[PDB]
Design a binder for this molecule. Structure first.
Ligand SMILES: Nc1ncnc2c1ncn2[C@@H]1O[C@H](COP(=O)(O)OP(=O)(O)OP(=O)(O)O)[C@@H](O)[C@H]1O
Ligand SMILES: Nc1ncnc2c1ncn2[C@@H]1O[C@H](COP(=O)(O)OP(=O)(O)OP(=O)(O)O)[C@@H](O)[C@H]1O
Ligand SMILES: Nc1ncnc2c1ncn2[C@@H]1O[C@H](COP(=O)(O)OP(=O)(O)OP(=O)(O)O)[C@@H](O)[C@H]1O
Lengths: 527, 527, 527
């Protein structure tokens, strides 16, 4: 596969052209006054999006050289998204500025490696300054303000997010789902729910809603399948002797056992129900064990210390205040397990969370903890059409990620003033040689880009706005939407520290490396 | 794959061109004086259709940028069709008008998102006004008028639909089927007809029509296959002892039992007949249960509380006044069950219908309810060729959907006056800022489009007609077909509220979102 | 396939063009002030590499004739990289210089073969001079200096490598792996770790970290799978009688023995744990023998002297001070085996090393030796993105290779002065005839190329710098990074002798042979 090689300024110019194209495409979506971007899909309706990463990841150029810069900027945006979940457009603009300055400052005697060293030094100093400047979050109003700002200045989403986290705690489980109505909703699921329905409709006893209901019902857990008639008779004997319903959670119920259950329920009125055990693999056993602790019962069929169903006892069956089972989902509301073991199980789960880190394992552990502790909340966003629902879901997810980040770390002035306030810190550095001085100057000049872009999107001269902000007091910033200088903290225009620092770090790291190239090798295009 | 990017005015112009082409193609079929569109088909005779959604879906543009607008308008039309079943052309024209007005107002200082918010606020106010203006449907005359207007001014369609809904109630089951004669027909099916034929022709006892006819006949319902000769003798013995016919509905009849039945009938004249069970699986079980309840009999072979056929009893067999069985269908006319049991079964059916919604499940539950309660109505449309039959079926389906919507909610003045009468409600709004004022003005100017289009299709000046309508009383409108101003309600020109509000909402929602684009990303055409 | 033939100066010019292109692409990355080269990747992000062999291996030219020279230079670079691991760019530049000089001197009467003979003679003399000038490496500071120089002036890598070699000896096992933090980290592994996890979670006894810890635990080693319950019980009585925990390392634990162990641990609290054996095939058996020797136990199931598990003895069980086992890895820290046998094992392994040499076999034997003697060290390189991590990892690997080469042999002045100091040796040769004199002259003039290139990359006249170096004292060269003449050894600018001599030998060997061509036969391009 023959290859083409270009030397010197030509390759840099072409790469800069590609970077500028992608950055210009992504920059028009920045600020409260930004505008959306339409992407043409290959199978159906186009996407109308306002996310920087989504726009960046859907641009590939014909020329083989510009595509290199496009790919590098895509990597910057994707890394920022993966690390923080927000602040991708800021990363893109910062990377573009750094790349432009680096390409402009090269000369015959310059040493790009030392320039990169100086850039990294300046970035480290700026990040330290940001960490000094931060402040924690304590009030729900701050949470609501962060959520509102991250969601394109929409107040309803912020209020919904604040209510959700208030109800299920700040570090709970929250998810976004497609709605079917015009207006969004918040639904909170409490107790134990595992999305399974009764096997046979004959167990229905409450027609309204086609649901089966009990009160103070014995709970039976069986890890393995229930096949032999001899393996159930003691349980029904106990339930009928103590005049209490019985809910049978087992891997499955065989034809003979199911026939016995249904016939007894029909002809004697004995209150009994059966549901499939939830989860697959080790998750099934884990959930069964957790239910056993929650309801104070015992599980049958464990490989270790196996217990036989033929010798069930009244103390082995857990007690639950309420049980609801329908076509699709089942709910155990009020367990009766002892508190100490519940707390110990919670402690073990949280300890396990820190042991092994994988998205699936971590998510499963968090879901189990939420089920066993406080519950989960579901956000359903509505709209007139699918395009609207998707576009709103993007913003809602951005708001959730930003709010979580603001819970983890403090908050700083929004609107790009957080970076502008760090310029003074760069005047205390002592560059070792000339190249590090060049790098420090590059970072100092680049720190102003975000606020300038936000002002530019509003249709006003950004440079004058920045000049005015720098000379004003410490807490004064520019409110793009209103178009006047206000007290940032009071008005609630705030941003998490994690997002800002991650964006700056990733952008600088990638762009500085890019600016040291001298030769570019590509493949000749095929016919 | 390489991709192309366009900025600002060029993308807007191309997308507007595509939208204009699609809407111009679709809008020539609006109003009573509209003309048809011929769609070329790749496997037979072309379609000659006057339906907006079909024309919208049958258009794809060679260029990529215009295709985006075409696809968005297709989404609008499809959403309106699925939600309401009518009013697709109105939605298309409203979407075009909103898109054009939004594009005409974008400038450097403009803020498209706030314009969208203002548009949504205005649309909500207008829909509230419409719901205020709505009035309920009370008499069959309004049903006939709605059906007639929905079917492009065809009185026979309205009369047929009104008669059908009178016969089978206002919420019965009505289905449209192709015809084989010049004149359309209405057929009512009462009792329980399930389209199953006698297993052996030897049971026929009436030459004319080759139909098996019985009076005051026992019915034997079996969920399991009848094969054993032992299991079938007792029922025949009871029937012979009581000297009454007997119809067997079962999963299937085996060689031995079938041979016994046929030979007994032939050599002794015993009155018997057997048919397959209708439906499959759980549906079959439910159908058998419903017949058992209706006929006052008992079902054998049920998995829960199973009853075996060897111990059949006289009180376990239902009685039906009349039984008709032929090669294609079998009908049970007059059941002999308990009225309270029937009422409870209907209550359960409707309650289940109120639990979970799916087209298949809802359709099946409705079919069972109609069979057990009032029956169904079948409409057969006539024509000289398939093209005419399809073109008329389109209108008949539109009429059914419009009449159903009119039954569900109120009715408002037709001919576009319903929207024209809502303009004053927008004059009571107070925009928060300039952008919301621009959006409100956009909707205020858009609300006149339907009347203007209807007038234009008639060959007169739309603006003059709209102006004259606006200065008249609150009850006067324009009769497009006749060509004079009349009392809209008195002449019977009315439309459902649901159609109007759905069209307005969908069109505004999609168009306003479309009008906030700044960039378009599309794939370069391949080779 | 049709082929094309070229004669004389045409072919030489074409091949020289190809060689010049490749060498120009590769030489811009030489010295402390070099610049990086970007390679376009077919499936993802491009590489940003400052590695000579990587650049050379990724250039192919459309023209058939140039590809010959490109391929020959690729061969030079690959051979140098394989033999030494460093000094690829020096080899490439030397090869270009030799090829150009040889091509320049071919005439009607010249004899290329004799020129090659003279070139080889001069190269041998220069290599002898280098070996005479070398000195051994003694202090850790020299190791740090060599690592820093080879790592492109990065002191952190040098310090890390020096510390690692101090900890795990100067001939231990060091591996480079991708990290997950901003800063590179050094992790040292001691004892014996084979990355195997506990068979069943029930064995966990330390809640924090979900680990299993024992002190002074009996060790049972079984080459073959332990399945029959009778084959594991006697060890259990032994352990429960001596009141010590037992660790069962075997090929696998079947459901029977596994059930016995887990049940006893759960119900009686007996301290036991089991793990799979490491590695496959003969490696597994060798590892088991090594553990047996270290712990002082005996391996069960050996093909020779097959010792059945039914007769375990208190003295046949290994003893280990500490045991840690978790979901992924297990560790035995302080074995109680006899020292003398440990030595005999070590001498046996090292004796086996020298007999057979295959990369897999050498790696495995070295791993076993390190595990049994001193342990291993892991170098984790940090970074913000994949490109940065790869770029740093290249330099780290080059530093490791250079440090190993400098430990194996001596060190010589860096910056190209080592070769410059060897020119006087060539003045003592007496060419047999004219052609050998021409070859000696070619090598004499070529020896200056590395220093000239390094000076050129810094942005100064290379000729003046090399001339001033040659006329100065022996211990004075040019410091490119600072830009002044200094004492090379004192400043710590040194290189290994192996790298220099290998690069010179390979470059001369290939270029001299290339410079004796007269006809080039190439395949005609296809369609
Ligand atoms: N009303 C406002 N006035 C001033 N600055 C604002 C205002 N609202 C948001 N900002 C600032 O603008 C930026 C928010 O824009 P945006 O959400 O597009 O940025 P991003 O996080 O980089 O990208 P995205 O969220 O699309 O991935 C943040 O700097 C936020 O501080
Ligand atoms: N004789 C009439 N005079 C005035 N307006 C009329 C008359 N007949 C129908 N209309 C109005 O014209 C529209 C009916 O046309 P049409 O059926 O093409 O529109 P649509 O409901 O948007 O689409 P579709 O063809 O799918 O039903 C409705 O607004 C109806 O109120
Ligand atoms: N500060 C310095 N001043 C002078 N010479 C230096 C300095 N640092 C390194 N050198 C010399 O420059 C050369 C380093 O270049 P480099 O490591 O790129 O060459 P290479 O070993 O041929 O290639 P590579 O390591 O990429 O495979 C070596 O000769 C080293 O001795």
């Amino acid at each position: 596969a023959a290859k083409d090689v270009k030397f010197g300024a030509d390759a840099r110019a072409l790469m800069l052209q590609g970077v500028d194209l992608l950055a210009d495409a992504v920059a028009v979506t920045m600020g409260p006054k930004g505008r959306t971007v339409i992407i043409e899909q290959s199978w159906g309706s186009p996407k109308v999006t306002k996310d920087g990463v989504t726009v960046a990841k859907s641009i590939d150029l014909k020329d083989k050289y510009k595509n290199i810069g496009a790919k590098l900027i895509q990597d910057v945006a994707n890394n920022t998204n993966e690390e923080a979940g927000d602040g991708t457009t800021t990363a893109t603009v910062l990377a573009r500025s750094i790349a432009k300055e680096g390409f402009e400052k090269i000369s015959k005697g310059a040493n790009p490696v030392e320039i990169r060293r100086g850039v990294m030094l300046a970035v480290d100093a700026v990040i330290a300054e940001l960490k000094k400047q931060s402040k924690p979050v304590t009030t729900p109003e701050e949470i609501a303000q962060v959520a509102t700002i991250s969601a394109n200045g929409d107040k309803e989403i912020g209020n919904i997010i604040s209510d959700a986290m208030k109800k299920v705690g700040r570090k709970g489980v929250i998810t976004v789902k497609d709605g079917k109505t015009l207006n969004d909703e918040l639904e909170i699921i409490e107790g134990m729910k595992f999305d399974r329905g009764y096997i046979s409709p004959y167990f229905i006893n409450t027609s309204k809603g086609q649901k089966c209901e009990f009160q103070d019902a014995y709970v039976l857990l069986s890890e393995k399948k229930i096949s032999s008639i001899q393996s159930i008779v003691p349980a029904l004997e106990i339930a009928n002797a103590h005049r209490k319903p019985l809910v049978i959670i087992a891997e499955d119920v065989d034809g003979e056992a199911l026939s016995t259950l249904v016939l007894n329920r029909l002809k004697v009125g004995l209150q009994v129900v059966a549901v499939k055990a939830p989860g697959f693999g080790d998750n099934r056993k884990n959930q069964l064990k957790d239910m056993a602790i929650a309801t104070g019962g015992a599980v049958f069929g464990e490989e270790g210390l196996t217990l036989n169903l033929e010798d069930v006892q009244p103390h082995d069956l857990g007690k639950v205040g309420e049980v609801i089972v329908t076509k699709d989902d089942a709910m155990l509301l009020k367990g009766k397990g002892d508190k100490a073991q519940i707390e110990k199980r919670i402690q073990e789960i949280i300890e396990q969370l820190d042991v092994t880190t994988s998205e699936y394992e971590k998510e499963k552990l968090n879901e189990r903890l939420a089920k066993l502790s406080d519950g989960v909340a579901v956000l359903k966003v509505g709209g007139t059409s699918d395009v609207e629902v998707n576009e709103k879901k993007d913003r809602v997810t951005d708001a959730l990620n930003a709010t979580r980040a603001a819970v983890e770390e403090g908050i700083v002035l929004g609107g790009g003033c957080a970076l502008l306030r760090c310029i003074p810190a760069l005047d205390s550095l002592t560059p070792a040689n000339e190249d590090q001085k060049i790098g420090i100057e590059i970072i100092k000049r680049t720190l102003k880009i975000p606020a300038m872009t936000i002002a530019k999107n509003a249709g006003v001269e950004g440079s004058l706005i920045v000049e005015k902000i720098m000379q004003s007091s410490s807490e004064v910033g520019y409110d793009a939407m209103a178009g006047d200088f206000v007290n940032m903290v009071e008005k609630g225009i705030i941003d998490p520290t994690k997002v800002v620092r991650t964006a700056l770090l990733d952008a600088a790291g990638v762009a500085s490396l890019l600016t040291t190239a001298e030769v570019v090798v590509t493949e000749i295009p095929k016919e």
